[PDB]
Enzyme design. Sequence first.
Site, PDB file in Angstrom:
ATOM      1  N   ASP A 291       0.842  -1.200   0.000  1.00  0.00           N
ATOM      2  CA  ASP A 291       0.000   0.000   0.000  1.00  0.00           C
ATOM      3  C   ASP A 291       0.874   1.245   0.000  1.00  0.00           C
ATOM      4  OD1 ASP A 291      -2.129   1.930   1.176  1.00  0.00           O
ATOM      5  OD2 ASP A 291      -3.254   0.119   0.672  1.00  0.00           O
TER       6      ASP A 291
ATOM      7  N   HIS B 154      -3.100   4.833   4.866  1.00  0.00           N
ATOM      8  CA  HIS B 154      -3.927   3.644   4.665  1.00  0.00           C
ATOM      9  C   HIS B 154      -3.173   2.361   5.001  1.00  0.00           C
ATOM     10  CE1 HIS B 154      -6.464   0.746   2.367  1.00  0.00           C
ATOM     11  NE2 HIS B 154      -7.391   1.482   2.972  1.00  0.00           N
TER      12      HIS B 154
ATOM     13  N   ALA C  62      -8.760  -7.304  -1.958  1.00  0.00           N
ATOM     14  CA  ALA C  62     -10.074  -6.687  -1.872  1.00  0.00           C
ATOM     15  C   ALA C  62     -10.729  -6.681  -3.248  1.00  0.00           C
ATOM     16  CB  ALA C  62      -9.913  -5.244  -1.371  1.00  0.00           C
TER      17      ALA C  62
ATOM     18  N   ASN D 194     -14.088  -1.139  -4.642  1.00  0.00           N
ATOM     19  CA  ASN D 194     -14.923  -0.119  -4.002  1.00  0.00           C
ATOM     20  C   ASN D 194     -15.839   0.618  -4.986  1.00  0.00           C
ATOM     21  OD1 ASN D 194     -14.221  -0.222  -1.169  1.00  0.00           O
ATOM     22  ND2 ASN D 194     -12.184   0.456  -1.781  1.00  0.00           N
TER      23      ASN D 194
ATOM     24  N   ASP E  75     -11.922  -6.408 -13.081  1.00  0.00           N
ATOM     25  CA  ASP E  75     -10.671  -6.067 -12.381  1.00  0.00           C
ATOM     26  C   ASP E  75      -9.850  -7.350 -12.381  1.00  0.00           C
ATOM     27  OD1 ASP E  75      -8.734  -6.049 -10.243  1.00  0.00           O
ATOM     28  OD2 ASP E  75     -10.099  -5.006  -8.861  1.00  0.00           O
TER      29      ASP E  75
ATOM     30  N   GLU F 110     -18.758  -4.232  -4.816  1.00  0.00           N
ATOM     31  CA  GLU F 110     -18.963  -4.733  -6.169  1.00  0.00           C
ATOM     32  C   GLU F 110     -19.300  -6.222  -6.092  1.00  0.00           C
ATOM     33  OE1 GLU F 110     -15.111  -2.108  -7.613  1.00  0.00           O
ATOM     34  OE2 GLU F 110     -15.839  -3.651  -9.035  1.00  0.00           O
TER      35      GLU F 110
ATOM     36  N   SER G 277     -11.299  -2.139   1.263  1.00  0.00           N
ATOM     37  CA  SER G 277      -9.881  -2.166   1.577  1.00  0.00           C
ATOM     38  C   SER G 277      -9.624  -2.376   3.062  1.00  0.00           C
ATOM     39  CB  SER G 277      -9.215  -0.872   1.095  1.00  0.00           C
ATOM     40  OG  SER G 277      -9.821   0.248   1.701  1.00  0.00           O
TER      41      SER G 277
HETATM   42  C1  LIG Z   1      -8.164   2.314  -8.206  1.00  0.00           C
HETATM   43  C2  LIG Z   1      -7.757   1.620  -6.892  1.00  0.00           C
HETATM   44  N1  LIG Z   1      -8.125   0.374  -6.646  1.00  0.00           N
HETATM   45  N2  LIG Z   1      -8.865  -0.265  -7.601  1.00  0.00           N
HETATM   46  C3  LIG Z   1      -9.239  -1.532  -7.348  1.00  0.00           C
HETATM   47  N3  LIG Z   1      -8.910  -2.172  -6.216  1.00  0.00           N
HETATM   48  N4  LIG Z   1      -9.910  -2.137  -8.315  1.00  0.00           N
HETATM   49  C4  LIG Z   1      -6.882   2.240  -6.021  1.00  0.00           C
HETATM   50  C5  LIG Z   1      -6.665   1.730  -4.754  1.00  0.00           C
HETATM   51  C6  LIG Z   1      -5.758   2.353  -3.888  1.00  0.00           C
HETATM   52  C7  LIG Z   1      -5.038   3.464  -4.307  1.00  0.00           C
HETATM   53  C8  LIG Z   1      -5.224   3.960  -5.589  1.00  0.00           C
HETATM   54  C9  LIG Z   1      -6.135   3.332  -6.457  1.00  0.00           C
HETATM   55 CA   LIG Z   2     -13.768  -2.428  -9.551  1.00  0.00          CA
END
Ligand SMILES: C/C(=N\NC(N)=[NH2+])c1ccccc1
Ligand SMILES: [Ca+2]
Length: 466
Positions: free
Chosen positions: A44, A85, A183, A186, A197, A222, A259
Amino acid sequence: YQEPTDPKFPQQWYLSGVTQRDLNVKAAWAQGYTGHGIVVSILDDGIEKNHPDLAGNYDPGASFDVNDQDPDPQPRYTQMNDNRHGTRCAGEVAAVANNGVCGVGVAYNARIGGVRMLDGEVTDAVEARSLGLNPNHIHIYSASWGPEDDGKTVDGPARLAEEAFFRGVSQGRGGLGSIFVWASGNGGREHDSCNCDGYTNSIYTLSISSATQFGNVPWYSEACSSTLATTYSSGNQNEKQIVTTDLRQKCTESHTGTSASAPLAAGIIALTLEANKNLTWRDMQHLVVQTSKPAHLNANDWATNGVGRKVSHSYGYGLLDAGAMVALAQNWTTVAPQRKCIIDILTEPKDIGKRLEVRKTVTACLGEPNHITRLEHAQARLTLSYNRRGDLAIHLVSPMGTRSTLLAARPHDYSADGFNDWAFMTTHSWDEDPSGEWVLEIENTSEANNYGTLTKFTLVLYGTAS
Ligand SMILES: C/C(=N\NC(N)=[NH2+])c1ccccc1
Ligand SMILES: [Ca+2]
Ligand SMILES: *[C@@H]1O[C@H](CO)[C@@H](O)[C@H](O)[C@H]1NC(C)=O
Ligand SMILES: C/C(=N\NC(N)=[NH2+])c1ccccc1
Ligand SMILES: C/C(=N\NC(N)=[NH2+])c1ccccc1
Ligand SMILES: [Ca+2]
Ligand SMILES: [Ca+2]
Ligand SMILES: [Cl-]
Ligand code: NA
Ligand code: NA
């Protein structure tokens, strides 16, 4: 064993609950399992390694700074606390217990590290270097990043990151395989559909969705067939949130989103690995399938699959159950080597139009070394053109009658680029026999006169014959 004394442990309702709306973690702690000897890394925005609830468990060997190319993952401090985070997630897994600070981690004796990799340009190389960090030291990786959750993107790991996944599950952890806990996204408010994804849609990631305190599907969730299970997270303003370590040596009671669910899952998986250090990456997914609990999670799509398990596109197989996980782990027999049966389906391209159904009866590689009678993951790898991608809905029905949604309509997805061998994945037919008739359904959910062509449908079965 005694209950943790940390000041905020009573606020950690998803652990300390006495009303059965919890992850059944005290039951695992009471069996003796705390994460001792297990190593977890948070991929992260960094980790505050000197946090008073993390320092005692911090592991430099589980940590690196990929953004600045140095060993120290300390976050970049800013006026808005943007890079908090990873520290929040780390505490969920492994915050120190009985130390008068904040609350506790699920695996409060595990070692915990962080990779600082989101605070910068996140390229394929950055992702791969993070996923591949020290894979014979780190047991479990936790991540919640992926493509934009805008409800119009179809994207996943590029080459280096995909190679990192296959290297991790094949040679990681002494050949038992890195456990990549993920995860599912979101993008709920954008009507996103998470098989779009490629990180969470991967078979190599153990994918986790969220449930609110009152047992509902949160606004940000989702739905998709690739999800395996669920942990609690945030919901509306009458429902409690996740309580954990925060940047600047603080606590927080307002960690949120899917997350926040993946780290709790990673912690439960650390307890499980302490109970049986020999579990493979596939063993761990089997345990999750067998022990997760639908009860009192509300969804309108609970369906019973071919082996009698309830499964939902919002929750997978339901809420993780730590006590059940650690109990079943202890005498678990390693699954047989993974087989892969490839079935190229079409003899000609098929016009989609308003609706297309493709039926095919398969033997699942009968007679061959890759014969599968016990499915794990299944993919429908589809290549198709269509004038507006988000008007499509796609379903796949197994021979046992289990209807997996591969793709729901995505109102914002105006793309005319279609799908290019996109490997839509379902967990919902796990342990079914995949021999027999499979049905692919593609439908235009709009009143518009949309058009396009399906040019390839490869059914890919993974699993065993024992
Ligand atoms: C776009 C995203 N996550 N998208 C996903 N998990 N499909 C994200 C998460 C953390 C920081 C910056 C972007
Ligand atoms: Ca997604
Ligand atoms: C781990 O599992 C493999 C495969 O079943 C087995 O050969 C090996 O002996 C096991 N190791 C331990 C330490 O249990
Ligand atoms: C990891 C990622 N994208 N990965 C991809 N698109 N394959 C990302 C997207 C937005 C912000 C930060 C990271
Ligand atoms: C592994 C790979 N490509 N391998 C090659 N071209 N030899 C790949 C490409 C795009 C996305 C994900 C993986
Ligand atoms: Ca640094
Ligand atoms: Ca503490
Ligand atoms: Cl493969
Ligand atoms: Na996954
Ligand atoms: Na059924």
